[PDB]
C-alpha cells in the first residue's frame, strides 16, 4: 500500500492546485493545464465505467456503470456542441473556457477584442476617462469620443445580438460617456 | 479490483463536475460543494503524505513525502491567512472565494454591496442609464444622480483604498455619468 499511498498522495496534490490556482486571471499556465486535464478526463472516465460494467460484481453495478457512462458521454457531447457553436459565432479561444458563456466583441484598432460578460444586457454603457476606452468595465485601450466603434456584438451559444452607438456626451479633459443599445438579435453567426 | 474500479470511476466523475460546472456565476450549489471539497482535501492530503513518509519504500520517498507535506501545509496556511486578512478588510463572504482577490464595496440602500474586481484601478467610472446604477460594469440597483454614493472602497489582502466622488454629468432621461478617484491607500481595515 506504500506505493499506492504515495500515488494517491500525488493524486490529491493535483486536485489542490486545480481548485485553488487554475483560473484565467490567476495563473494562465495552470489554466491551460486544467483545460488539458478536463479534455483528458472524459475518455478515461467513460472507459473506466464501461470496464466496471463488463467486470461487475452483479447486474445492479452493471446498470449503474451503464448509466454513469451515458451521463459522462452526455456531458462530453454537450460541452463540445456548446463550444463549437460559440466558436462558430465568435471565432475566439474564450469559447472553450468553461467559466464563460457570454462574449463581447469590439472592433478596435483594426482588430476584434473578445471579453467575457457576466449578464446579457439590453443596453451597454461606455466611459472614456482621459482617452482610455472602457466598455462594460473592461479596459480595452486608448480611444477618442469621435473614434468610438460604431457597432459591437454580444455572442452566446444560441443567439447573436447586435448593438449600435447612441447618446454620446463630452466632458472636459478628453473624457466622455456613450451608450450601446440592441437593435437586432437575429442574423445568427458571422 | 472491481470494487476499486467502481470507486475510481466515481472518483473521476466528481473531478469532471467540479472543473466544468462549479463556478460562482454557474451552479452555486456545486460552488459550495467545491469549497467544502477543498477544505476537506487539505488535511487528507497532509495526513496521506505524512503516512507515506512514516511508511516509506526508501529514504528518497521519505524526503519526497516530507517536502510534499510541507508544501501542502504552506498552501493551507497561505490560503487561511489571505482569506482572514481580506475578511478583516471587507467582512464579506467573497473573501473565501479562491477565484477573486480584489473586492469593491459600495454603500447603497442602507447596506454595503460587495462585488469582485478583475484589476485594481486608480479611477473608477459609473453610469446611470435610466436610473440603474452600474459601477465598474456591475449592476447594483436603482439610483439617481443626486443619490450617488459619496465614497466607495476597494479592499484587498494587503491594502485598503479609498475613493471619492468627482466630475458628475447629466444627460436627458434620468441618465448620467460619474467618476471615483483614489485619494488614500493607507488607513487599513475598518
Amino acid at each position: 500500500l506504500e506505493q499506492w499511498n504515495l500515488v494517491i498522495g500525488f493524486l490529491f496534490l493535483t486536485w489542490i492546485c486545480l481548485l485553488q490556482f487554475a483560473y484565467a486571471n490567476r495563473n494562465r499556465f495552470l489554466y491551460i493545464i486544467k483545460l488539458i486535464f478536463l479534455w483528458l478526463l472524459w475518455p478515461v472516465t467513460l472507459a473506466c465505467f464501461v470496464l466496471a460494467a463488463v467486470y461487475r460484481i452483479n447486474w445492479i453495478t452493471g446498470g449503474i456503470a451503464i448509466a454513469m457512462a451515458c451521463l459522462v458521454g452526455l456531458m462530453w457531447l454537450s460541452y463540445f456542441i456548446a463550444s463549437f457553436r460559440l466558436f462558430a459565432r465568435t471565432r475566439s479561444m474564450w469559447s472553450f473556457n468553461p467559466e464563460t458563456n457570454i462574449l463581447l466583441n469590439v472592433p478596435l484598432h483594426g482588430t476584434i477584442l473578445t471579453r467575457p460578460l457576466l449578464e446579457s444586457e439590453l443596453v451597454i454603457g461606455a466611459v472614456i476617462l482621459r482617452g482610455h476606452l472602457r466598455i462594460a468595465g473592461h479596459h480595452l485601450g486608448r480611444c477618442d469620443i469621435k473614434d468610438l466603434p460604431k457597432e459591437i456584438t454580444v455572442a452566446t451559444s444560441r443567439t447573436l445580438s447586435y448593438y449600435k452607438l447612441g447618446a454620446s456626451q463630452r466632458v472636459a479633459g478628453d473624457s466622455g460617456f456613450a451608450a450601446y443599445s440592441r437593435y437586432r438579435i437575429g442574423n445568427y453567426k458571422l | 479490483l472491481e470494487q476499486w474500479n467502481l470507486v475510481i470511476g466515481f472518483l473521476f466523475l466528481t473531478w469532471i463536475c467540479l472543473l466544468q460546472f462549479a463556478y460562482a456565476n454557474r451552479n452555486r450549489f456545486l460552488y459550495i460543494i467545491k469549497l467544502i471539497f477543498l477544505w476537506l482535501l487539505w488535511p487528507v492530503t497532509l495526513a496521506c503524505f505524512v503516512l507515506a513518509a512514516v511508511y516509506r519504500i526508501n529514504w528518497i520517498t521519505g524526503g519526497i513525502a516530507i517536502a510534499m507535506a510541507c508544501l501542502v501545509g504552506l498552501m493551507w496556511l497561505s490560503y487561511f491567512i489571505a482569506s482572514f486578512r481580506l475578511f478583516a478588510r471587507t467582512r464579506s463572504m467573497w473573501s473565501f472565494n479562491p477565484e477573486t482577490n480584489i473586492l469593491l464595496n459600495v454603500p447603497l440602500h442602507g447596506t454595503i454591496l460587495t462585488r469582485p474586481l478583475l484589476e485594481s484601478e486608480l479611477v473608477i467610472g459609473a453610469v446611470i442609464l435610466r436610473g440603474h446604477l452600474r459601477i465598474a460594469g456591475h449592476h447594483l440597483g436603482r439610483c439617481d444622480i443626486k443619490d450617488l454614493p459619496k465614497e466607495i472602497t476597494v479592499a484587498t489582502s494587503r491594502t485598503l483604498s479609498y475613493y471619492k466622488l468627482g466630475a458628475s454629468q447629466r444627460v436627458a432621461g434620468d441618465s448620467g455619468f460619474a467618476a471615483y478617484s483614489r485619494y488614500r491607500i493607507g488607513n487599513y481595515k475598518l
Partner: antibody
Amino acid sequence: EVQLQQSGAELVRPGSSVKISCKGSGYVFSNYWMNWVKQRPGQGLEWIGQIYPGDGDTNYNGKFKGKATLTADKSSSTAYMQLSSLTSEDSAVYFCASGYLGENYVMDFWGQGTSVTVSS
Amino acid sequence: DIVLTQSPASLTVSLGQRATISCRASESVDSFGNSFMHWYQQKPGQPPKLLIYRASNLESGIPARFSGSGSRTDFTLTINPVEADDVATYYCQQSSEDPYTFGGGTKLEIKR
C-alpha cells in the same frame, strides 16, 4: 433639451407625391432612430418604419412598403419621408419620434405632427 | 402581427375612484427576459405621451398615480386617484416583433 420639429400642412392632388420633413436639435442626430407613426383622422395610430441616419438602415411595416420611402441628411440634421401615388386614404397626421438613449423600441419625444390633405 | 385588443372601448369613472384598462395580445409579447409593452396618453390635438414602458416601469416626469402590471399576454394599466385632467385616450403598443402594432384605444370619461 431634445426636440423634434416638422414641416407645415400639405395640400396635394390625388396621384401626386409629397415629402414630409422632421429635424431635431439638442443631440447627435446621426446616433438615433426615428419611427414615423401615422394617425388617421378618425382611427388610431399606425407604424410605418424606421431609419438610422448614421448609415441608412431602415425597417418597414410591409403595408407601407412602396408607398413610403425614408431618407436622411446628416449634414443638415434633417430626415425625410416621401409618400407616392397619393389617394384619399392617405389623408392623416404623420409624427416622428425617438428615444432618449437613441433606441429603436421606445418613443420618448415626439414631433407636433404634419397634416396632409389629398383633395382636388 | 400581434393583435392587441383593449377592454373596454369607453370608460366612465367618478372623480376619485380608480380606473382599470386592459390590453390583450394575439401572441406572447415576452422576449428574452423582457416584456416590451408600452402605454400612451393622447389628448386631442397633441402627440401621444408615454406613461409606462416595458409593462412595469414608470416614465420620468409622469405622476406616480399611473401604474402598470401584467406579463405574457394579459396586461393592465391602473389610475387609482383619477383627476379631471386625465380625460384622454389610452393605447397599448408592442415592440417585440418588427411591425409594431397599437391597441384600439380606450376613451376615458369622467362622471360628475
